[PDB]
């Protein structure tokens, strides 16, 4: 069962095949499958308590002692220090679900664990694991087709954001920001709709800037249709607020020019020294006057500048900020509608950005100042500024808002939704059940195991809500069978009705399909592994 | 590195090594740069002998730091996290977080930190 | 032995000779073959190997598994070497070679234990292998019509057969059609570097796509990149090998001026050099600019102001594929950017694939290259998908070279075994036993298939032997129905070269192993 | 059963009921035997020794 082969020859002579073979272990056959299945079951059972509105958070501590309180399954699995290879496969599955969809990173783990748990008892009865994988693939295809059948379309137009707000609220319900639920959903929807290519094209998340500052309250989080900069005006005596600002974006430091090539300027006489001093002074005055000529009310640089330029900028009533980062320079240029100018001689009036208000923001007794640029004409970049009572809820709000943005992006890509709360899982399990009866006997066990594994999500939701899992799930399934209504789910919030149509529990069809597909493929890959050769 | 007990020299016109330590020679050889285990960098004027200004911005001790390609009055990448300062303002103008040692790329637009960050994009490039 | 005050060889030298040494060699070869036994057939299984660094590799490919094992037995390394040889020359059959070699050695082990001279066994192997290769060339089915539809169908069937043992066997028809489409667009040399393999995490297997063009990931865009439009409808592409940055004119260059006017002139001259390069690029009419060397922020903003697209630090092979697809030329100088050296594609677009941004060059009508974008839920998932697609690609390329096929599922080997047994029954008798052992050894692959499928190997083998003896050439193991079937009519097709190379390499390995009688191991130097 | 949300006391009582029913079924399938019937004794002994 371990250590591999060890015979030392049938003649007594040394028998060495693999380098350092006496310190290596090996698993063969069904024992490897059982070990992998129980490892995946442990991971899935750890994750399953953080599913749904009543799910509980996990407190992750890294090797440096930093504490992360989170409900995001992908984050939990990423920060979990695992050594078993199947656990690493579960972590990679969560990361893949996060990358492709951004929501449902916990459902995939629970579904895969349930699938492997059913496959275990299927293997115990003498079925080849490849046959189990084939049955799982067939059932997954049936479930995906049924999901497409029962899918419903929503309007993505900006004139009516109610379905989008409902979907964002459904995504945010399980997170800690459900206190500010509607505000958070509204700002997520507005942020995604503001920065997007309307012709069902992609959403560039680099245009969405998410910043979090401690202090204030979580309800103080707001969406700014501009840029939040973590800088302030260079000279302390310049005005702290500019209105109707004509903004000049520059990537050249306000310093005398220097060639990139190795250069030596030789001063050979007193006249040369005087000429050099005059050249320096005139260069400073000339760059300041060139900036002032275009009519700019405010100048933003990237590489900082020295005292002479600072005092000339203050003297000419030109507020300015230095050392603005490259991404922030790009965001400011996009939002204000102005071009990026590489040197003063190329600065004109038409390249000036326009902002209705540029202000400096204080944050209480903290000495920290941050710049805000807003009231742009047609700002194509937004900033989500998150406040909270501690940094940990700020990080959690950041990842929850990222989940909401990803969900609205998925709705942008495809506008078909399926009602959650376990209704989709129950309907898919039923459809797999009918499709199994028509199928010949041998694949029936695999299909019914797939259906039972699909049934874990409503049972997990019921258990997290304190309700009896089996009884509630059976009652809801019977109600779904009786009247043709695939929108009946688990009343996690105890609103009094099991219809997710009225409860507005809405999920993207793409997310459900991707969950089912990824879980099935990972389960097949794990089922096909029969040897481990750890050192 | 400690210089000899008396430098064993007689009127070399450069025996004024100073280095009172009450480090790295900056390119404009008029200032000296000291970082201690407390995590705070110090600027001293070698001529006057006065502490120009400090750089309290590193929670962890600054094991290594590197200078600008030239005098440049700025840059000062310091590796505790990689932080870039400006002596014209005394603030962490640019910070990075993703330290064995930090070496500044001679081109001026990047720096390598120790088993590479780009200053024009605030992101790792290599 | 005796102390021998001054010993002959260095102290610590280990020597083994005689029958026990060769028997131990055979046992080591058996041990190596046991490590890949369960990876053969549609019912095969994957293996997980963890190295010292803790990185796990999951593979169904025999050559990869053998390479990962740190084999140190000198006789056992021959199996790994022949697996590598089979992978290099053919690309498929890396498990069959090792199984055949080990089975040959196992079958001849009883004769070795009786004191039979190794040269007789070597001659018997050589004769049997020559006869088997001649029989394969004789009975291989080929079509002398050069029909495009028939050729494409044959290529697709060969790809499906090569793919119906991997984790992507469920989508084997889809992936085989993709592979055949990719291979048919290579021009004359079928260079593997002309087929790009991109792996993007997330998404299902069916989400993977083949780009009739070139696609690569976004490469560290500078500031001002987001103002560049991300879609063009008839762009002209300027493939360059040029650093579009403000930089020193040369490494050893030095400027010596003694006037502020000359200082300003030098600064403006550097700026004018950069702007002249950019203007020469712009006047060429190109809308998409790809460079092998970095493109700076100044150039990025310059191109953004002109509604152009720039992408620096593009990998060299991606630029080569872009040249082969769009149809331009990589320019190290921008002085002559004529229309001849400019690429052209119908649609260029930047989209998001699973959290990563990719640049797509689609609509190329004269493309001679491809790009696979593989989607999967794990790193090793995508790696093993790539390995399976590589196996299929080698199979399709070899089929392009020569469209000669034989039925799989062990049918060809059962036919060869019957032929060799019939031949051996008509020779004096010292070689008869060895050739019969060779023929019996050829039955390992159908037996291994039945064992992996959980079948009854003895009954299936008896039925196959009876069917081949009483008439029928392409009857092999039917995995789905747990019986035997005409694998040629079931489209279980393999190129004849796969089995030819497998038999040749296995016979050579067996002869080399048998030919050795003594092993000497000098003591390690600098053990540290 | 426990994972479905069943208290491990309903399971015990249900198992007791199932055991009683199974005892009834096994008694139903049983056949009377007399010690004079040597063939049945030999068959029982051979069945016992079959697995050894
Ligand atoms: N208001 C609700 N009522 C019932 N079920 C809900 C509600 N909100 C979410 N759920 C269910 O909770 C499950 C888990 O969702 P969530 O924890 O937000 O993300 P993840 O899918 O990553 O765990 C979903 O499958 C969804 O069906
Ligand atoms: N559909 C099929 N039915 C029966 N046998 C098959 C089928 N497809 C492939 N095989 C068998 O699988 C063997 C090759 O297994 P595989 O692992 O794919 O490649 P390798 O030869 O490298 O092991 C071939 O000998 C072939 O006869
Ligand atoms: Mg969710
Ligand atoms: Mg193969």
Q: What are the DSSP calls for C202-238, one per residue? A: SS-GGG-EEESSEEEE-----TTGGGS-SEESS-EEE
> Active-site residue among A98, A232, A403, A452?
A403
Instruction: Find, among A492, A464, A462, the residue nearest to A474 by Cα.
Output: A462
User: In angstroms, what separates the C-alpha of D3 from chain A's closest C-alpha?
Assistant: 9
Cβ atoms B52, B76 nearer than 8 A: no
Instruction: Find, among C341, C377, C342, C347, the residue nearest to C359 by Cα.
Output: C347
Using alpha carbons, list the distances in angstroms from residue C332 to A523, C244, C277, C336: 50, 11, 12, 10
Contacts by residues A144-150 (CB-CB < 8 Å, ≥ 24 positions apart): A144/A513, A144/A516, A144/A517, A146/A427, A146/A428, A146/A431, A146/A432, A147/A418, A147/A424, A147/A428, A147/A509, A147/A512, A147/A513, A147/A516, A148/A416, A148/A509, A148/A513, A150/A418, A150/A424, A150/A427, A150/A486
Task: State CA A100 to chain mean position distance.
Answer: 10
Task: Using the mean position of ligand 2's atoms as its centre, give its distance from the Cα of residue C284 in Å.
Answer: 54
CA-CA-CA-CA torsion for D3, D7, D13, D17, nearest 10 degrees? -40
Known catalytic membership, residue C322: no
Instruction: Find, among C41, C51, C46, C448, the residue nearest to A36 by Cα.
Output: C46
Task: Using the mean position of ligand 1's atoms as its centre, give its distance from the Cα of residue C116 in Å.
Answer: 74
User: What is the sign, positive or negative, of the torsion defined by CA atoms of A373, A374, A380, A384?
Assistant: positive
User: Is A121 near chain D, with CB under 8 Å?
Assistant: no
Q: Which of A330, A350, A380, A520 is the best mutation test for C, with the most CBs of C within 10 A?
A: A330
- Cα C28 from Cα A299, distance rounded (Å): 77
Known catalytic membership, residue A531: no
Known catalytic membership, residue C94: yes
- For residue A91, the chain C residue with the least C-alpha distance is C378
Resolution given for this structure, in angstroms: 2.9
Chain D residues closer than 8 Å to A470 by CB: 4-6
CB within 8 Å of A496: residues ≥ 6 apart: none
Residue A464, token pair as written in the block? 């997290």
DSSP, collapsed to helix, strand or coil, labels residue C298 as: helix
Could you tell me which chains touch chain B, where touching means 3 or more CB pairs under 8 A?
A, C
Residue at token pair 């709705």: A411
Return the ∠ at Cα A521 (arms to A517 and A526), rounded to 5°.
150
> Active-site residue among A46, A106, A170, A383?
A106
For helices C496-515 and C77-89, give the axis angle rounded to 10 degrees: 160
Cβ atoms A94, A105 nearer than 8 A: yes
Beta-bridge mates of residue C193: none
Chains B and A touching, counted as 3 or more CB pairs less than 8 Å apart: yes
Element holding C521 (H helix, E strand): strand C518-521
Q: In what order do the strands lie in the sheet with B123-124?
A: B102-104, B110-113, B117-118, B123-124
Known catalytic membership, residue C51: no
Alpha helix ranges (H) inside C75-117: 77-89, 94-113
* Exposure class string for C315-330: b at 16+ Cβ within 10 A, else e: eeebbbbbbbbbbbeb
Chain C residues closer than 8 Å to B118 by CB: 220
> How many CB atoms are located within 10 Å of the residue A464 CB?
21
Task: State CA C409 to chain mean position distance.
Answer: 22
- Cα D52 from Cα D47, distance rounded (Å): 10
Using alpha carbons, list the distances in angstroms from residue C443 to A246, C38, C103, C161, C162: 85, 16, 9, 20, 20
Strands (E), C110-228: 141-142, 195-201, 209-211, 214-217
Element holding C62 (H helix, E strand): helix C62-68
Q: In what order do the strands lie in the sheet with C370-376?
A: C195-201, C370-376, C209-211
The answer to whether the CB atoms of C222 and B125 lie below 8 A apart is: no
Residue A203, token pair as written in the block? 């959403």
- For residue C379, the chain A residue with the least C-alpha distance is A92
Cβ atoms C174, C423 nearer than 8 A: no
Question: What is residue A63's DSSP assignment?
Answer: T
Chain C residues closer than 8 Å to A257 by CB: 263-264, 267
Query: Chain B 61-120, CB below 8 Å of chain C: which residues?
Result: 107, 118, 120
User: In angstroms, what separates the C-alpha of C272 from chain A's closest C-alpha?
Assistant: 12
User: How was this structure obtained?
Assistant: cryo-EM
Measured from the Cα of A175, ligand 1's closest atom is 18
């Amino acid at each position: 069962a371990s250590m591999g082969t060890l015979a030392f020859d049938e003649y007594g002579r040394p028998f060495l095949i693999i380098k350092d073979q006496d310190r290596k272990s090996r698993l063969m056959g069904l024992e490897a499958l059982k070990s992998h299945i129980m490892a995946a079951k442990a991971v899935a059972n750890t994750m399953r308590t953080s599913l749904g509105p009543n799910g509980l958070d996990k407190m992750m501590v890294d090797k440096d002692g930093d504490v992360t309180v989170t409900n995001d399954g992908a984050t939990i699995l990423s920060m979990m220090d695992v050594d078993h290879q199947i656990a690493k496969l579960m972590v990679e599955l969560s990361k893949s679900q996060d990358d492709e969809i951004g929501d449902g990173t916990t459902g995939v783990v629970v579904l895969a664990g349930a699938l492997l748990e059913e496959a275990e008892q299927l293997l115990d009865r003498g079925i080849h694991p490849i046959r189990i994988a084939d049955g799982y693939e067939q059932a997954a295809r049936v479930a995906i087709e049924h999901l497409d059948k029962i899918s419903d379309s929503v309007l993505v137009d900006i004139k009516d954001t109610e379905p989008l707000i409902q979907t964002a609220k459904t995504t945010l319900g399980s997170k800690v920001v459900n206190s500010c639920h509607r505000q958070m959903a509204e700002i997520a929807v507005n942020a995604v709709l503001t920065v997007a290519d309307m012709e069902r094209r992609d959403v560039d998340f680099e245009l969405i800037k998410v910043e979090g500052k401690v202090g204030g309250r979580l309800e103080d989080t707001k969406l700014i249709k501009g840029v939040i900069v973590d800088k302030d005006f260079s000279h302390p005596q310049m005005p702290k607020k500019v209105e109707d600002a004509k903004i000049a974006i520059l990537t050249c430091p306000f310093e005398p020019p220097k060639p990139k090539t190795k250069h030596k300027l030789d001063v050979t006489s007193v006249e040369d020294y005087k000429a050099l001093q005059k050249y320096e002074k005139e260069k400073f005055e000339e760059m300041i006057q060139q900036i002032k000529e275009t009519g700019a009310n405010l100048a933003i640089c990237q590489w900082g500048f020295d005292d002479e330029a600072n005092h000339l900028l203050l003297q000419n009533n030109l507020p300015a900020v230095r050392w603005v980062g490259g991404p922030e320079i790009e965001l400011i240029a996009i939002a204000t509608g102005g071009r990026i100018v590489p040197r003063f001689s190329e600065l004109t009036a038409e390249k000036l950005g326009f902002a209705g208000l540029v202000q400096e923001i204080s944050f209480g007794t903290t000495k920290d100042k941050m710049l805000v640029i807003e009231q742009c004409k047609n700002s194509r970049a937004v900033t989500i500024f998150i406040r909270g009572g501690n940094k940990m809820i700020i990080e959690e709000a950041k990842r929850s808002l990222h989940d909401a943005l990803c969900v609205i992006r998925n709705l942008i890509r495809d506008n078909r939704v399926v009602y959650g709360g376990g209704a989709a899982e129950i309907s898919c399990a039923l459809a797999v059940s009918q499709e199994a009866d028509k199928c010949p006997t041998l694949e029936q066990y695999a299909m019914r195991a797939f259906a039972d594994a699909l049934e874990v999500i409503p049972m997990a939701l019921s258990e997290n809500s304190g309700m009896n899992p089996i009884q509630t799930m059976t009652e809801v399934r019977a109600r779904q069978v009786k009247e043709m209504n695939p929108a009946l789910g688990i009343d996690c919030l105890h609103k009094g009705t099991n219809d997710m149509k009225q409860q507005h529990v809405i999920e993207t069809l793409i997310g459900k399909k991707q969950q089912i597909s990824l879980a099935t493929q990972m389960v097949r890959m794990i089922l096909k592994i029969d040897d481990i050769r750890k050192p | 590195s400690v210089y000899p007990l008396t430098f064993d020299k007689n009127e070399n016109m450069a025996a004024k090594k100073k280095s009172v330590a009450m480090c790295s020679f900056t390119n404009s050889d008029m200032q000296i740069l000291t970082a201690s285990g407390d995590g705070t960098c110090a600027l001293w004027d070698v001529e006057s002998g006065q502490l120009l200004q400090s750089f309290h911005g590193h929670g962890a001790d600054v094991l290594c730091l590197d200078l600008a390609p030239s005098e440049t009055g700025n840059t000062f990448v310091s590796g505790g996290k990689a932080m870039v300062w400006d002596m014209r303002s005394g603030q962490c103008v640019q910070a990075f977080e993703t330290i064995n040692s930090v070496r500044y790329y001679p081109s001026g637009d990047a720096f390598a930190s120790g088993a590479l960050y780009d200053l024009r994009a605030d992101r790792e490039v290599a | 032995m005796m102390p021998t005050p001054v010993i002959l060889l260095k102290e610590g030298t280990d020597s083994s000779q005689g029958i026990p040494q060769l028997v131990s060699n055979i046992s080591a070869c058996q041990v190596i073959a046991e490590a890949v036994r369960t990876t053969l057939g549609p019912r095969g299984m994957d293996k997980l190997i963890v190295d010292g660094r803790g990185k796990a590799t999951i593979s169904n490919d025999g050559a990869t598994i053998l390479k990962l094992l740190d084999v140190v037995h000198p006789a056992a390394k021959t199996l790994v070497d022949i697996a590598k040889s089979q992978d290099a020359e053919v690309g498929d059959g890396t498990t069959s070679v090792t199984l055949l070699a080990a089975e040959f050695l196992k079958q001849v082990k009883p004769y070795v234990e009786e004191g039979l001279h190794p040269q007789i066994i070597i001659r018997a192997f050589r004769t049997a292998t020559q006869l088997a290769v001649n029989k394969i060339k004789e009975i291989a089915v080929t079509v002398k019509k050069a029909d495009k539809v028939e050729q494409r169908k044959l290529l697709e069937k060969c790809a499906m057969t090569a793919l119906s043992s991997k984790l992507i066997s469920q989508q084997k028809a889809f992936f085989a059609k993709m592979v055949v489409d990719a291979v048919m667009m290579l021009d004359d040399l079928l260079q593997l570097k002309m087929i790009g393999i991109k792996k993007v995490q997330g998404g299902a297997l069916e989400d993977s796509q083949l780009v009739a063009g070139v696609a690569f990931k976004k490469t560290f865009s500078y500031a001002g990149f987001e103002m560049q439009p991300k879609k063009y409808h008839n762009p002209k592409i300027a493939l360059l090998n040029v650093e579009l940055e403000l930089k020193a004119e040369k490494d050893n260059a030095e400027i010596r001026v003694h006037t502020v006017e000359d200082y300003q002139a030098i600064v403006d001259a550097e700026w004018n050099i950069l702007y002249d390069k950019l203007e020469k690029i712009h006047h060429s009419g190109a809308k998409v600019v790809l460079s092998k060397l970095p493109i700076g922020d100044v150039a990025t903003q310059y191109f953004a102001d002109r509604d152009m697209f720039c992408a620096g630090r593009v990998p060299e092979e991606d630029l080569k594929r872009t040249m082969m697809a769009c149809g331009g030329s990589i320019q190290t100088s921008v002085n002559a950017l004529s229309a001849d050296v400019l690429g052209r594609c119908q649609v260029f677009e930047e989209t998001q694939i699973g959290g990563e941004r990719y640049n797509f060059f689609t609509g190329c009508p004269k493309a001679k290259t491809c790009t696979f974008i593989l989607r999967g839920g794990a790193e090793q998932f995508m790696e093993e998908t790539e390995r399976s697609l590589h196996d299929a690609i080698m199979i399709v390329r070899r089929a392009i070279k020569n469209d000669s096929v034989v039925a799989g599922g062990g049918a060809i080997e059962m036919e060869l075994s019957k032929y060799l047994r019939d031949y051996s029954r008509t020779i004096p008798g010292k070689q008869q036993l060895l050739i019969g052992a060779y023929a019996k050894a050829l039955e390992i692959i159908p037996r291994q298939l039945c064992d992996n499928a959980g079948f009854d190997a003895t009954n299936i083998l008896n039925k196959l032997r009876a069917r081949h003896a009483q008439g029928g050439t392409w009857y092999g193991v039917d995995i789905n129905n747990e019986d035997i079937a005409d694998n040629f009519e079931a489209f279980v097709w393999e190129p004849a070269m796969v089995r030819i190379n497998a038999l040749t390499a296995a016979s050579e390995a067996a002869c080399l192993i048998v030919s050795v009688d003594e092993t000497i191991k000098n003591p390690r130097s600098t053990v540290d | 059963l426990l994972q479905k949300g069943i208290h491990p006391t309903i399971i015990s009582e249900s198992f007791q009921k199932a055991l009683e029913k199974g005892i009834e079924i096994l008694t139903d399938m049983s056949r009377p035997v007399e010690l004079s019937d040597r063939e049945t004794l030999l068959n029982s002994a051979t069945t016992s020794l079959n697995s050894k």
